[PDB]
Write a protein that binds this DNA or RNA. Structure first.
Ligand SMILES: NC(=O)c1ccc[n+]([C@@H]2O[C@H](COP(=O)([O-])OP(=O)(O)OC[C@H]3O[C@@H](n4cnc5c(N)ncnc54)[C@H](O)[C@@H]3O)[C@@H](O)[C@H]2O)c1
Ligand SMILES: [K+]
Ligand SMILES: [K+]
Ligand SMILES: [K+]
Ligand SMILES: [Mg+2]
Ligand SMILES: [Mg+2]
Ligand SMILES: [Mg+2]
Ligand SMILES: [Mg+2]
Lengths: 248, 30, 255, 309, 33, 57, 56, 123
RNA sequence: UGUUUGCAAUUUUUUAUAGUAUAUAUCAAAUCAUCUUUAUGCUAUUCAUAGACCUUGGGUACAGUAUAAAAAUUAUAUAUGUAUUAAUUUACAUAUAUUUUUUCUAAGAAAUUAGGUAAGAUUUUGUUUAUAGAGAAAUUAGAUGUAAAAAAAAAAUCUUAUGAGGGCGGAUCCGCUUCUAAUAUUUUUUUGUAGUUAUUAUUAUAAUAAUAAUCAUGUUUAUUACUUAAAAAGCUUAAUGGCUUAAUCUUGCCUUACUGUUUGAUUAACAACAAAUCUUA
């Protein structure tokens, strides 16, 4: 619906926006002007490349809507037309370049990388449209980097140290702040001492985790999504950290 | 005005068709 | 192709186009937007079933259980009942045909949806005028201490609509006028019509007195009725005529 | 259920989607050509008036959201990548970064009247006028905490240029009006002088500049190119001054005439404007923040470096 | 334009009729003035 | 009588902005160019990438 | 009220100096009542007290 | 002067008398836009109430943690509420280096770059 | 056929039919200059048609991923080449004005125009924060807060009523008078404060309790109501008073800045008269 709405609004702007004056961008009798007129002629006078063929004036201006199952509104079609137009169609001397001689433009990169296909959970470029979470196994139960809070340091100063001792210092990270975003309280057994874990949100900009020579008894790590966390973390350990999750 | 150009355009079409016809008869004769 | 089908454009469009419901027109943005409203109305209806069953649980609950007694039990169901009425309107407020049927005057006024748009339209231009007449003509506080109209009333003399507070000729205002009323709430009630002339000059006491020119009671009215002829109040329609229509008049010299 | 019975039975939102056989025969281009005649016009002919002549005038004007209205602007055309970033990654960080805890049973804070009143036993204190704003003559707005219900965001941006030399060379104002037209995508409004200075040859009440204003998505897109395509290209740029801010949440800063021609819209057609006529601008960012520090924190979230000066 | 021609003729007749009444009444006013 | 002003907006296009990092995104602009490649941007600047080492009396 | 802000009498009555905090909170008015024992400002909900002023 | 005429021509086409007129839709056409408009705003309502729900949930996760942290004792010989009082300090939160620019500068993109992520980054 | 081409959608009115006043259609006016050739041309391809690689031509295309099948089509004069005629007749093309489609040199870039009327706006001055060039002094953007699901009930103190034609003395006249209604006032006796979304706890996805948010079916540039001391700005000229709920400002239409006569006042204009001032019909 968003694509259909954008395309629907792009044509309503064609009927209300002032026409496009090529004189203000292209000088008459130049490589750019000739290149623009040739491509404009193929688009049937429409100076835009992402609204198909539609004339805001004339006797056929009322027929602006598109029927069901149309490709013109898709994002793939929009990007395809904009890329096929970025290629020069006229040499610097004003002569049209042959069809087979035109140099195509470098196409964009695919949204799904090789990691998505391979399914490597230790890669940070996987699920580029979702938020990944660093989960580490302890010699076994999966969890986040955790540790005891000494008497000299605080909550944020302790989280920074544990992260460097567990995941190494080769990560460009930033602790959001001192406020904890979630807590998991394990009541005591009247015996065993309870635990009041306080989690601090963190964000990684670049780098990769390193478990070599870690101080804690850590074995493996993996960057999981919000959907894969509930399948890995325990029920009680997940119900307490799910409130910190985001939309994506 | 619009239909005026229409009628005057169709009128010129007949004249062009009369020229196309008559000139064709000469080409065949030659 | 007769007038029973609509205007010329419809009878003309209904002869050169294909027979297909308006909601089934194959348009991309129109069918992607209709699906958003479709699966939404299904959620509103799923909520009405959830809230209706919640009142049963509260209804079948001893008032003693509630810390506030029976007083706190009704204020909770009241908020629930009012919440359902809003869901019955939001389920059809986005329907494109409910708007078409209402604008064409073919809307069923017994349903909350049409009575909602009917009042929303009346409160846009007609209420602002009648509200002004009550103030500029000093109908308040003269006749009543305070008055806020809640229904529409359009009176026409001999088939001619009269503007609110318009000077009419003594000959035009000689027969009982036809009241084109319209109520916006459900149910059937008995109405009482009164026509009062509040400017009769009393020269003996140097003041004005009010005179009733018409009075009728026990007139059943529902949101489906629109026209009421004050001529036949006890003959055709049910009602008790307290005073027949008196031709309005004004002596020369008085305002 | 009686409630469901009160709903529209002839629901159009519950009809099945169109079919392929009926869609293949739906050819609007063929209907007009096949008709071979002009369809009679409808009897409903109401057009929005050119002037609003009151709330009780017979002919009324429709809202701006009505397509036929004279003020209708086509809706959004795309989702700016900057507004999607903020609402996705940064909206929660600002809330988590700046956050103060309130006990569960904390009583609501009642605001104090900033215009004091005289209270006492003196018979004169009764009808005394309210005291003046203590300190400054105008009351400053109070800061609102950054909670989950108040997330500072960008609202609009005003790009204004002042060309005093346009009073002598009228061609300097025409070029300035065209630069801001392409840079922002709107029709700038000409501005006039308000003071006279014989030393500067400034005359009041004469056109000496222009201005624009972009709202909604148009503002996020301007910041998208400004921060990621214009400012990085300025030579020896230190950042936005740390002193910018009107104490109410609006950040202001200007660009040199050599930095305005770096805009992708101006450099593409640079040879169309006369030489030495591309002016600077005073870019004013208006945000929903309620303080001077909340604005800097908002711009810091969008990748705007601030240099101390 | 099979059945629409009849409706068009009805529209044309409605217009040609008014144009006749307007010209038939405008002439009466010019005689009274 | 309050005048109802109309919007005077110039023609706008949909442009693909390819950053120096290779990433692309669509934007709304007035220039007719379809693809705008940026050789210098935040992804290629030291003020925005202080930790980046490649750009780095 | 006159052109020069002079307040005249529009009917035959008795002058009254009063304050109507309902109409305007910080204004003082002058009125004319038909009965000397009337008290202005009249309550907004009471009927208008008017005289015919006509002879038959 | 010739170049300036190219500018005046650009403003002339934007004159109120030159710009296109207000739209003129029929009923079936007007109703079709009425649903597209009635649905788009509803779509925004769903995206808003969803976006505002996550903000309320994330906020309630902190209130529960901070509230609990305010009652904890320790670590060691530390009075109750110490970590809470230290967790509410805003030292450098509103400074110049508050948020790292490397994170804020990286915005979303329709498609990734030649190198989506940099795993070879070294301190 | 004015009005956007798929279909009863604004207000009033005309006419006609049914109908016993209403209903439907139709017409006119108001609101608005939306631009309209159903293809006659273009485009692509092919087939003829010239010979040192030309003009003019006939076909083909089958259109929702809309299409070659209109992204904008005029007239006229001169003159040339091809070509044609009884002819500067016709067709074609250029040579270049000249006109129409107003669609291409920004009036929504320009005046401080001051009265009548209607609508809309409501601190504009100064002070102050910030802002390429820009400084003591140039432009621009800002400078209060609250509310917007919703109340219900008991008594009392007045005041009002062209309320009950109240009662009693002299229907609507007047002083005493109970009752009822309404506004206001008590800090008053309280009762209720939900629903929705989400969190936490208990209980068996639901229920209950607590906590938090909650104007929102609406282009978030939301909107609406209320509030924001005083001075200052503005209101034809000094000074004083006044106006912000208009006497200011903006815009539309206008020119009552009208003709004759006339009322009551300025505690009987100026401590007389006269020339005056305001107001009424
Ligand atoms: N708008 C309302 O009706 C409404 C209702 C309740 C509360 N609020 C409050 O007002 C503020 C803003 O409301 P909002 O969140 O609904 O505004 P919004 O962000 O959804 O709309 C702002 C602008 O963004 C555009 N937009 C919205 N979604 C888009 C998309 N997917 N792609 C491209 N453009 C898009 C809109 O059309 C509009 O131009 C918030 O504080 C909100 O809680 C708004
Ligand atoms: K939204
Ligand atoms: K003030
Ligand atoms: K005026
Ligand atoms: Mg000022
Ligand atoms: Mg300065
Ligand atoms: Mg004036
Ligand atoms: Mg005297």
């Amino acid at each position: 619906f968003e694509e259909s709405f954008y395309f629907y609004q792009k044509r309503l702007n064609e009927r209300l926006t002032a026409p496009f004056r090529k004189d203000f961008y292209f000088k008459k009798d130049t490589a750019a002007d000739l290149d623009w007129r040739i491509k404009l002629k193929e688009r049937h006078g429409v100076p835009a490349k992402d609204i198909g063929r539609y004339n805001p004036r004339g006797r056929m201006a009322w027929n602006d809507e598109v029927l069901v199952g149309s490709q013109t509104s898709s994002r793939k079609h929009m990007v395809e037309k904009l890329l096929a137009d970025a290629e020069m169609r006229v040499s610097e001397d004003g002569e049209e370049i042959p069809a087979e001689d035109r140099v195509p433009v470098e196409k964009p990169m695919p949204r799904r990388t090789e990691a998505d296909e391979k399914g490597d959970v230790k890669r940070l470029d996987r699920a580029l449209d979702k938020t990944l979470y660093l989960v580490v196994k302890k010699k076994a139960k999966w969890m986040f980097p955790t540790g005891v809070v000494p008497t000299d340091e605080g909550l944020h100063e302790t989280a920074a140290r544990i992260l460097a001792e567990s995941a190494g210092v080769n990560m460009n990270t930033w602790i959001v702040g001192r406020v904890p975003v979630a807590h998991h309280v394990v009541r005591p057994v009247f015996l065993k001492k309870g635990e009041k874990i306080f989690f601090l949100k963190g964000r990684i900009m670049a780098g990769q985790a390193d478990l070599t020579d870690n101080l804690h008894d850590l074995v493996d790590f993996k960057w999981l999504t919000q959907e894969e966390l509930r399948s890995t973390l325990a029920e009680e350990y997940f119900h307490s950290v799910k409130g910190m999750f985001a939309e994506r | 005005f619009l239909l005026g150009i229409k009628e005057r355009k169709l009128a010129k079409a007949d004249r062009r068709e009369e020229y196309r016809r008559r000139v064709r008869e000469k080409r065949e004769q030659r | 192709g007769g007038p029973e089908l609509g205007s010329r454009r419809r009878r003309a469009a209904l002869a050169t186009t294909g027979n297909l419901p308006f909601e089934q027109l194959p348009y991309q943005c129109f069918q992607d937007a209709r699906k958003i409203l479709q699966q939404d109305r299904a959620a509103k209806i799923a909520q009405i079933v959830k809230e209706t069953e919640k009142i049963k649980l509260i209804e079948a609950r001893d008032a003693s259980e509630f810390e506030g007694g029976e007083a706190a039990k009704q204020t909770r169901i009241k908020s629930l009942r009012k919440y359902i009425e809003e869901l019955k309107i939001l389920a059809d407020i986005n329907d494109p045909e409910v708007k078409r049927r209402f604008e064409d005057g073919r809307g069923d006024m017994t349903k909350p949806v049409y009575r909602f748009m009917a009042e929303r339209r009346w409160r846009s231009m007609d209420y602002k005028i009648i509200a002004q007449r009550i103030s500029q003509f000093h109908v308040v506080p003269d006749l009543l201490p305070a008055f806020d109209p809640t229904m529409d009333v359009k009176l026409s003399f001999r088939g001619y609509q009269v503007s609110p507070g318009a000077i009419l000729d003594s000959r035009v205002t000689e027969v009982a006028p036809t009241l084109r009323m319209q109520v916006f709430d459900k149910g059937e009630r008995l109405l009482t019509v009164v026509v009062i002339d509040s400017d009769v000059p009393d020269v003996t006491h140097d003041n004005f007195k009010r005179r009733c020119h018409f009075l009728a009671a026990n007139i059943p009215w529902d949101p489906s009725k629109t026209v009421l002829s004050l001529r036949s109040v006890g003959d055709r329609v049910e009602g008790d005529v307290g005073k027949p229509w008196l031709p309005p008049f004004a002596q020369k010299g008085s305002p | 259920i009686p409630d469901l019975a009160e709903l529209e039975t002839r629901s159009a939102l519950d009809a099945p989607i169109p079919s392929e056989e009926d869609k293949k025969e739906f050819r609007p281009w063929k209907r007009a050509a096949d008709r071979k005649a002009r369809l009679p016009s409808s009897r409903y002919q109401y057009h929005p008036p050119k002037y609003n002549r009151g709330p009780l005038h017979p002919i009324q004007s429709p809202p701006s959201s009505d397509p036929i209205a004279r003020d209708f602007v086509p809706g959004p055309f795309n989702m700016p990548r900057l507004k999607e970033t903020f609402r996705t990654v940064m909206a929660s960080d600002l809330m988590t970064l700046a956050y103060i805890h309130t006990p569960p049973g904390t009583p609501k804070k009642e605001p104090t009247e900033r215009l004091r009143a005289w209270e006492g036993d003196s018979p004169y204190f009764a009808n005394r006028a309210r005291r003046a704003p203590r300190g400054a003559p105008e009351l400053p707005i109070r800061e609102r905490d950054i909670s989950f219900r108040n997330i500072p965001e960008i609202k609009e941006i005003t790009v204004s240029t002042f060309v005093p030399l346009g009073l002598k060379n009228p061609d300097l104002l025409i070029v300035a009006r065209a630069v801001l037209l392409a840079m922002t995508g709107t029709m700038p409004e000409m501005t006039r002088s308000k003071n006279n200075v014989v030393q500067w040859q400034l005359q009041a009440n004469k056109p000496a500049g222009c201005k624009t204003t972009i709202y909604g998505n148009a503002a996020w897109e301007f910041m998208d190119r400004l921060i990621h395509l214009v400012l990085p290209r300025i030579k020896d740029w230190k950042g936005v001054p740390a002193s910018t801010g009107d104490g109410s949440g609006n950040v202001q800063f200007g660009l040199n005439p050599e930095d305005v021609q770096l805009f992708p819209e101006v450099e593409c057609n640079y040879d169309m404007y006369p030489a030495k006529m591309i002016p600077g601008c005073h870019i004013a960012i208006k945000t929903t923040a309620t303080s001077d520090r909340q604005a800097k924190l908002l711009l810091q979230s969008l990748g705007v470096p601030f240099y101390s000066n | 334009s099979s059945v629409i021609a009849e409706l068009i003729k009805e529209k044309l007749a409605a217009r040609a009729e008014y144009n006749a009444r307007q010209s038939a009444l405008r002439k009466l006013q010019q005689q009274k003035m | 009588a309050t005048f109802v002003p109309r919007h005077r907006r110039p023609y706008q296009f949909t442009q693909l902005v390819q950053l120096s990092d290779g990433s692309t995104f669509t934007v709304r602009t007035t220039m007719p160019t379809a693809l705008y490649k940026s050789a210098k941007d935040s992804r290629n600047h030291l003020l925005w990438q202080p930790s980046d080492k490649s750009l780095k009396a | 009220m006159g052109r020069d802000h002079t307040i005249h009498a529009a009917v035959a009555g008795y002058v009254k100096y009063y304050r109507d905090p309902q109409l305007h909170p910080d204004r003082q008015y002058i009125g004319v009542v038909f009965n000397r024992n009337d008290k202005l400002p009249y309550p907004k909900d009471a009927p208008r007290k008017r005289k015919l002023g006509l002879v038959a | 002067d010739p170049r300036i005429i190219n500018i005046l021509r650009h403003f002339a086409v934007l004159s109120p008398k030159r710009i296109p007129p207000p739209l003129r839709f029929g009923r079936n056409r007007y109703l079709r836009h009425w649903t597209i408009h009635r649905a788009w705003l509803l779509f925004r309502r769903q995206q808003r109430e969803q976006r505002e729900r996550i903000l309320m949930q994330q906020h309630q996760s902190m209130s529960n943690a901070c509230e609990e942290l305010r009652n904890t004792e320790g670590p060691g010989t530390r009075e109750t509420g110490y970590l809470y009082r230290v967790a509410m300090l805003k030292n450098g939160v509103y400074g110049l280096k508050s948020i790292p620019i490397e994170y804020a500068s990286r915005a979303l993109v329709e498609t990734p770059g030649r190198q989506a992520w940099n795993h070879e980054w070294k301190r």
